[PDB]
Amino acid sequence: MDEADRRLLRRCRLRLVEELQVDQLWDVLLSRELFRPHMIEDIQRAGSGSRRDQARQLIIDLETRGSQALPLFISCLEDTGQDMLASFLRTNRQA
Amino acid sequence: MDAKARNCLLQHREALEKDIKTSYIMDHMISDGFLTISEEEKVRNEPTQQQRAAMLIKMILKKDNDSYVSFYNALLHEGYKDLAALLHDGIPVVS
Amino acid sequence: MDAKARNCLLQHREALEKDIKTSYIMDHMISDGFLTISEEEKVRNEPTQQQRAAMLIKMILKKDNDSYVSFYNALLHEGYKDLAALLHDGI
Amino acid sequence: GITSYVRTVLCEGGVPQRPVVFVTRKKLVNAIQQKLSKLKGEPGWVTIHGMAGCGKSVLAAEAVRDHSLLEGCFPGGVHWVSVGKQDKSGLLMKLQNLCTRLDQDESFSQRLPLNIEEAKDRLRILMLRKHPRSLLILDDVWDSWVLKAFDSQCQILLTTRDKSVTDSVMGPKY
Amino acid sequence: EFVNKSLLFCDRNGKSFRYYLHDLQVDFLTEKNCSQLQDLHKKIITQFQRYHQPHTLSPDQEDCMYWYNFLAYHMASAKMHKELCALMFSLDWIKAKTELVGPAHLIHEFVEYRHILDEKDCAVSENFQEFLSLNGHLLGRQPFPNIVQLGLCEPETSEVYQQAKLQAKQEVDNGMLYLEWINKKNITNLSRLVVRPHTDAVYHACFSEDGQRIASCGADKTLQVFKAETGEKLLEIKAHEDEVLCCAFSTDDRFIATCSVDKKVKIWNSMTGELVHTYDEHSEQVNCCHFTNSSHHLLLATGSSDCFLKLWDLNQKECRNTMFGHTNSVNHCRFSPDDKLLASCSADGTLKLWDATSANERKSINVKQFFLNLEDPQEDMEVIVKCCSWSADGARIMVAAKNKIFLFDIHTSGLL
Ligand SMILES: Nc1ncnc2c1ncn2[C@H]1C[C@H](O)[C@@H](COP(=O)(O)OP(=O)(O)OP(=O)(O)O)O1
Ligand SMILES: [Mg+2]
Known part of the structure; x- marks a missing residue:
């Protein structure tokens, strides 16, 4: 992941952890080979296991999953009906 | 390991250090018999993900052809497509 | 610049001098910021294009790695495909 | 398999060609080379040692003999210096000679330093700008002030008999 | 530094x-320091005298083990023979040295010792070596039986005898109830040497082809390899799977095959001691193993309880030729001097001179030559040959069974 994408993920930290729905997201992430299944189990157990803690670990770990991790992640957002969040992300990448 | 392999690691070291989540690599390498428990404990003792990756690579640079392959395979197997691609041309002949 | 770079230049500096036209190449290198106006006039002032090429190459040899790539890109961009090919080896 | 190019860089460097009757020491060469790879950037010294006649030089020549480690790693050429054993006066000349060798262009003053440190400056500056990625190899070396002289902050690897020699120096040592 | x-x-x-040091480093030293060296050694001994006396030596101190062995060594260079008498002769020094060193190093030292001192003493050394002959067999165990008491058994007089009687007299006034022995000159035909390699029963032993050393196994199944002369441990082997059945050196003594009940034919190296070759094929426990007598061909003939011979090709992991032939379990196995041939023996008693080159039968003398017209209901007696003895040229096969030795001529397939 390039520095600009990483920086984007940090800038949007608050919004991501506040709004990301994860339970519905795992299938999408798998389909696009963003994470291996055990990686997902680890993220699921991050911290207290709340939605927020899972979300946070997801987006941190996301930075390590490749050059195209960010656009692929936006797509998974789209695929799971999180258009608003995906929209917030995209309009930054472009910005 | 062969100089080709080692130089390939050296060239891409920074990318590797930034992305590798060692807990998903060291296991494979231990199973394969090319990383020791004490090396793994030395890795684990580093406080951050990138520091652990850095330590692990330090260790691997000193190992043999088989080890490089073990590393590469684990990378590929754990979905680090881009990272494996960087290491592909540096794969040494083994056995 | 790198050893292989400097040597690749030397290895083919003759074929280069016998074919390349400096003005277009210097326009590129000036734009890239790897050639100065003074350097450019010293090269242009040479009596024959072989000496201009020779002077340019003489100068590039004492330059950094980026200048080797600037000269290589210029050659390609200017149609000196075969000569750029010969320099591909250098970096 | 030596590349034709490797020989061209090596000739400029001046390392001796390996004796016709030689036998690779793959493990050892590999170790030095992988380690040698280690100081990817920033100063650094490597010491190699053995009781007399252990293949110490040939390995140094052999390690760099290969294309892979040298070419990708070392855009700067390799320079070999045969230090030997020296009184203070003798040491001085080697420095000037390295000065003349490194400055092929001659852009730098034709006049040569009469002071060791000034030569140290010419080396550091030349290594810093003229040959950015260069590696220097030394032969023998029997006393510390010697490496004190060569201590340019630019990687130099000394191969020897005493391992005490590189104690004056600063920076990572392997 | x-x-x-x-x-x-x-x-x-x-x-x-x-x-x-390196062997080269040491050699240089003698090359460049030789004149001093004879002089200095005296220098080391006197310093040791300024500290610990040899009796004042102790088991805990780190240096001491060096001290006995190289203590003995330095005095020799010193060239001081009276001092050498002051040390090596001392029987108590022998006692302590025996205690942690074992009774081999002293024998090795003695051979060096003989040149160093005097010919007349040499006899004293001869008397002591004779005193050692009785030492090896039971001395090491543990209950280091009061030698002072077991010593008074030698004949003639010698330095040892003279020393022993006086010691006994000294002991006697105090007590200790020593019993004098009055018949020695009338009894005991002494053997030159005795060895106990194993607390566990021995099963086989073999000379080095060079004759410089011998290897014996045992019930424990560890095999111990030794050089007989100085009689000092020269090899320790950790284990053999199962109980050892027999073992043997390679013709150039570069290998040691080891037969076993497990069926692990472990051919360990004879020098490094590390394993090299290994084999298995037998349906039953191996009866015998042997390397080819030929320097060229490398084969491993092996009898076993399954009766099948196994002619291994040592250059290959699998057998060169299985050889059914014996109607009974193999008793012994040896390569013929003609490597093309391969003789074998078994309980049926008939010799079997196999043609190894064709991997097929060639000759097999019947053995009913032990004729015996008893009232036994069985017909002609079923001879059971054991040892497969060879002529010094190996051109004919000596054997023995029941009540008679035989010398069969396998090349003519007839008794002689
Ligand atoms: N393949 C080989 N590797 C090493 N040494 C070889 C080989 N073939 C032949 N030799 C012999 C010939 C050379 O004289 C010698 C190599 O010299 P070298 O190892 O450089 O000694 P050295 O330079 O360490 O000695 P000094 O410590 O005196 O400088 O070893
Ligand atoms: Mg040398």
């Missing part, structure tokens, strides 16, 4: 440090 000068290699074994 030396180690840095690379003139003396380091040894970081635990807290302890042992420094040592």
Whole structure:
């Protein structure tokens, strides 16, 4: 992941952890080979296991999953009906 | 390991250090018999993900052809497509 | 610049001098910021294009790695495909 | 398999060609080379040692003999210096000679330093700008002030008999 | 500082440090320091005298083990023979040395010892070696039986005898109830040497082809390899799977085959002691193993309880030729001097001179030559040959069974 994408993920930290729905997201992430299944189990157990803690670990770990991790992640957002969040992300990448 | 392999690691070291989540690599390498428990404990003792990756690579640079392959395979197997691609041309002949 | 770079230049500096036209190449290198106006006039002032090429190459040899790539890109961009090919080896 | 190019860089460097009757020491060469790879950037010294006649030089020549480690790693050429054993006066000349060798262009003053440190400056500056990625190899070396002289902050690897020699120096040592 | 000068290699074994040199480094020293060396050694001994006396030596001290062995060594260079008498002769010094060193090093020292001192003493050394002959067999165990009492058994007189009687007299007034023995000159035909390699029963032993050393196994199944002369441990083997059945040296003594109940034909190296070759094929426990007598061909003939011979090709992991032939379990196995041939023996008693080159039968003498017209209901007696003895040329096969030795001529397939 390039520095600009990483920086984007940090800038949007608050919004991501506040709004990301994860339970519905795992299938999408798998389909696009963003994470291996055990990686997902680890993220699921991050911290207290709340939605927020899972979300946070997801987006941190996301930075390590490749050059195209960010656009692929936006797509998974789209695929799971999180258009608003995906929209917030995209309009930054472009910005 | 062969100089080709080692130089390939050296060239891409920074990318590797930034992305590798060692807990998903060291296991494979231990199973394969090319990383020791004490090396793994030395890795684990580093406080951050990138520091652990850095330590692990330090260790691997000193190992043999088989080890490089073990590393590469684990990378590929754990979905680090881009990272494996960087290491592909540096794969040494083994056995 | 790198050893292989400097040597690749030397290895083919003759074929280069016998074919390349400096003005277009210097326009590129000036734009890239790897050639100065003074350097450019010293090269242009040479009596024959072989000496201009020779002077340019003489100068590039004492330059950094980026200048080797600037000269290589210029050659390609200017149609000196075969000569750029010969320099591909250098970096 | 030596590349034709490797020989061209090596000739400029001046390392001796390996004796016709030689036998690779793959493990050892590999170790030095992988380690040698280690100081990817920033100063650094490597010491190699053995009781007399252990293949110490040939390995140094052999390690760099290969294309892979040298070419990708070392855009700067390799320079070999045969230090030997020296009184203070003798040491001085080697420095000037390295000065003349490194400055092929001659852009730098034709006049040569009469002071060791000034030569140290010419080396550091030349290594810093003229040959950015260069590696220097030394032969023998029997006393510390010697490496004190060569201590340019630019990687130099000394191969020897005493391992005490590189104690004056600063920076990572392997 | 030396180690840095690379003139003396380091040894970081635990807290302890042992420094040592290359053979080249040592040789240079004698080359450049030889005149001094004879002089100095005297220098070391006197210093040791300023400290510990040899009786004042102790088991706990780290240096001491060096001290006995190289203590003995230095005095020799010193060229001081009276001092050498002051040390090596001392029987108590022998006692302590025996105690942790074992009774081989002293014998090795003695051979060196003989040149160093005097011919007349040499006899004293001859008397002591004779005193050692009785030492090897039971001496090491543990209950180091009061030698002072078991010593008074030698004949003639010698330095040992003279020493022993006086010691006994000294013991006697105090007590200790020693019993004098009055018949020695009338009894005991002494053997030159005795060895106990194993607390566990021996099963086989073999000479080195060079004759310099011997290997014996045992019930424990460990095999111990030794050089007989100086009679000092020269090899320790950790284990053999199962109980050892027999073992044997390679013709150039570069290998040691080891037969076993497990069926692990473990051909360990004879020098490094590390395993090299290994084989298995037998349906039953191996009866015998042997390397080819030929320097060229490398084969491993092996009898076993399954009756099948196994002619291994030592250059290959699998057998060169299985050889059914014996109607009974193999009793013994040896390569013929003609490597093309391969003789074998078994309980049926008939010799079997196999043609190894064709991997097929060639000759097989019947053995009913032990004729015996008894009232036994069985017809002609079923001879059961054991040892497969060879003529010195090996052109004919000596054997023995029941009540008679035989010398069969396998090349003519007839009795002689
Ligand atoms: N393949 C080989 N590797 C090493 N040495 C070889 C080989 N073939 C032949 N030799 C012999 C010939 C050379 O004289 C010698 C190599 O010299 P070298 O190892 O450089 O000694 P050295 O330079 O360490 O000695 P000094 O410590 O005196 O400088 O070893
Ligand atoms: Mg040398």
